[PDB]
Amino acid sequence: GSMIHRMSNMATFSLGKHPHVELCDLLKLEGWSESGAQAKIAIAEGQVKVDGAVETRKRCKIVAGQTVSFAGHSVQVVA
Template sequence: MKQIKITTEFIKLDQLMKFADMVDSGGEAKMLIAQGLVLVNGEICTQRGKKIRPGDEVEFDGQNYQII
């Protein structure tokens, strides 16, 4: 599991995917989230603006990311 450190209270899911280099662009992140290909805390998330906070886990493309 990869750890992603954020220095704010939260980060939006699409911004996190770009920040963590899961995707090349914000547009790509929005498309993948809308298609239901991203899991947050084990559940499919289709909200690109979902607030991700330390302690949350994001899964995409077979990789797990823990937000710290």
């Protein structure tokens, strides 16, 4: 056997029982952007790649066990 992890990156966001969230909310809360739109992590994250979406809107209609991806920041969400 030769395959050990390092620090372990279990990036998992919570949603609960809401209609959905904005790329800024998911990100900001998850700890992506300190402000939400400073490094353009909002609009960007969109245009990057989302679990089922390849767009770049201001708000996103996603819920449950879905993932979001931006540049190098990849995290999943549950609801």
